[PDB]
Structure 1
Amino acid sequence: ITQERKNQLINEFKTHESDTGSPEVQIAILTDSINNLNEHLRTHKKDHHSRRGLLKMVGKRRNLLTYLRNKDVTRYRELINKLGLRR
């Protein structure tokens, strides 16, 4: 994940000017990493070590989504639409 792409994501999803810690922001960064990493694994199918990194990312994302849904259901629903998640 390049730095300019990351700046796009954080600005697009941040809840306010200085916000970088919000669930929304974190889930956006993770979602790109997860998608980006999936593409790498499609070619390097046997890279089991890297894949373990993906599994932690997937767990982190689920926990942030679970937190958001329980905190404020509205915010949660908006985010999964913008990101196109099935959750």
Structure 2
Amino acid sequence: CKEEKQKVIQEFARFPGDTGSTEVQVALLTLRINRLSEHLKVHKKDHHSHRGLLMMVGQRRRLLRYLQREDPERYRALIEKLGI
């Protein structure tokens, strides 16, 4: 994933070398929340791994909450640069 993860970081960074901004963080949660749902499909018995998903979904909503009520400009772009 130092390939895939890093791809999205290059994609959602705010500057050459950014890896922690609210954007990159959301981009990663996003990417992570998708690769797990796709998983849960195959292994729908896994109720345990489901938990994790519940969290990342919340963790992401909270970061977004922060951004929305912090810099909408940056917000609106990030949400229409993915979905919601």
- What is the CA distance between 1:3 and its match in structure 2? 2.0
More helix by share: 1
* Equivalent residue letter for 2:17: S
Q: Calculate the TM-score normalised by the size of structure 1.
A: 0.91
The DSSP-based 3-state class of the residue aligned with 2:15 is coil
Percent identity of paired positions between Structure 1 and Structure 2:
58
> Which residue in the other structure is 2:5 paired with?
6
Size of the aligned set, in residue pairs, is 84
> Which residue in the other structure is 2:77 paired with?
78
State how far apart, in whole Å, the 2-side matches of 1:18 and 1:71 are. Answer: 22
> Which residue in the other structure is 2:49 paired with?
50
> Which residue in the other structure is 2:22 paired with?
23
> Which residue in the other structure is 2:37 paired with?
38
The DSSP-based 3-state class of the residue aligned with 1:3 is coil
The DSSP-based 3-state class of the residue aligned with 2:17 is coil
- Residue deviations 1:30-70, cap 9 Å, x none? 00110110000011111011111111111110011111101
Q: Calculate the TM-score normalised by the size of structure 2.
A: 0.94
Which structure 2 segments of 5+ residues have no match? none
State how far apart, in whole Å, the 1-side matches of 2:57 and 2:81 are. Answer: 18
State how far apart, in whole Å, the 2-side matches of 1:14 and 1:81 are. Answer: 16
* Equivalent residue letter for 2:65: T
Which structure 1 segments of 5+ residues have no match? none
* Stretches (4+) displaced over 4 A: none
